[PDB]
Amino acid sequence: SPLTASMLASAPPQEQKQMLGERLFPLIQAMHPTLAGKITGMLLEIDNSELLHMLESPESLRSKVDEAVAVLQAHQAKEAA
Amino acid sequence: TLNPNAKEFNPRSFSQ
């Protein structure tokens, strides 16, 4: 049972984010098991239509996750110092 | 753009 745009339309905005995160999380965790919760949280700031696109396009998701990891790691370097 | 201070996401399960 895949997530569809009509499924999401049945839900309040905050629930839609959670629904999107549920589908994204296993994919993100596969790529980066340690950072997965934080990375998913970061991506959930993106508009829901764009998140749907990311769910449909592995290349798009991977580029965004790469961006998120690089940002998180750069931030961590600043805080670690 | 992406904010590294974003709320962490909590899944229904990790076996996801």
Curated annotation (Swiss-Prot), chain A:
Superkingdom of source: Eukaryota
Protein's UniProt name: Polyadenylate-binding protein 1
Protein localization: Cytoplasm; Cytoplasm, Stress granule; Nucleus; Cell projection, Lamellipodium
Residue ranges of every copy of the PABC domain listed in the record: 2-77
Misc note: Many viruses shutoff host mRNA translational machinery by inhibiting cellular PABPC1 activity using different mechanisms. Picornaviruses, caliciviruses or lentiviruses encode proteases that cleave PABPC1 at several defined sites in the proline-rich linker region between RRMs and the C-terminal domain. Rotaviruses, gammherpesviruses and bunyamwera virus relocalize PABPC1 from the cytoplasm to the nucleus thus altering its function. Many of these viruses translate their mRNA in a PABPC1-independent manner and are unaffected by host PABPC1 inhibition.
Expression by tissue: Ubiquitous.
Annotated function: Binds the poly(A) tail of mRNA, including that of its own transcript, and regulates processes of mRNA metabolism such as pre-mRNA splicing and mRNA stability. Its function in translational initiation regulation can either be enhanced by PAIP1 or repressed by PAIP2. Can probably bind to cytoplasmic RNA sequences other than poly(A) in vivo. Binds to N6-methyladenosine (m6A)-containing mRNAs and contributes to MYC stability by binding to m6A-containing MYC mRNAs. Involved in translationally coupled mRNA turnover.
Subunit-level organization: May form homodimers. Component of a multisubunit autoregulatory ribonucleoprotein complex (ARC), at least composed of IGF2BP1, PABPC1 and CSDE1. Directly interacts with IGF2BP1; the interaction is enhanced by SEPIN14P20 peptide RBPR. Part of a complex associated with the FOS mCRD domain and consisting of HNRPD, SYNCRIP, PAIP1 and CSDE1/UNR. Interacts with the PABPC1-interacting motif-1 (PAM1) and -2 (PAM2) of PAIP1 and PAIP2. Interacts with PAIP1 with a 1:1 stoichiometry and with PAIP2 with a 1:2 stoichiometry. The interaction with CSDE1 is direct and RNA-independent.
PTM statement from Swiss-Prot or TrEMBL: Phosphorylated by MAPKAPK2. Methylated by CARM1.
Domain free text: The RNA-binding domains RRM1 and RRM2 and the C-terminus (last 138 amino acids) regions interact with the PABPC1-interacting motif-1 (PAM1) and -2 (PAM2) of PAIP1, respectively.
UniProt region ((Microbial infection) Binding to HRSV M2-1 protein), positions on chain: 2-81
UniProt organism field: Homo sapiens
Family designation: Belongs to the polyadenylate-binding protein type-1 family.
From Swiss-Prot, chain B:
Residues of the full protein shown: 913 to 928 of 1313
Subunit note: Monomer. Can also form homodimers. Interacts with TARDBP; the interaction is RNA-dependent. Interacts with RBFOX1. Interacts with polyribosomes. Interacts with SH3GL2 and SH3GL3. Interacts with SH3KBP1 and CBL. Interacts with EGFR. Interacts with ATXN2L.
Known function: Involved in EGFR trafficking, acting as negative regulator of endocytic EGFR internalization at the plasma membrane.
Disease cited in the entry: Spinocerebellar ataxia 2: Spinocerebellar ataxia is a clinically and genetically heterogeneous group of cerebellar disorders. Patients show progressive incoordination of gait and often poor coordination of hands, speech and eye movements, due to cerebellum degeneration with variable involvement of the brainstem and spinal cord. Amyotrophic lateral sclerosis 13: A neurodegenerative disorder affecting upper motor neurons in the brain and lower motor neurons in the brain stem and spinal cord, resulting in fatal paralysis. Sensory abnormalities are absent. The pathologic hallmarks of the disease include pallor of the corticospinal tract due to loss of motor neurons, presence of ubiquitin-positive inclusions within surviving motor neurons, and deposition of pathologic aggregates. The etiology of amyotrophic lateral sclerosis is likely to be multifactorial, involving both genetic and environmental factors.
Name of the encoding gene: ATXN2
Subcellular location: Cytoplasm
Tissue expression as described in the entry: Expressed in the brain, heart, liver, skeletal muscle, pancreas and placenta. Isoform 1 is predominant in the brain and spinal cord. Isoform 4 is more abundant in the cerebellum. In the brain, broadly expressed in the amygdala, caudate nucleus, corpus callosum, hippocampus, hypothalamus, substantia nigra, subthalamic nucleus and thalamus.
Assigned protein family: Belongs to the ataxin-2 family.
Entry protein name: Ataxin-2
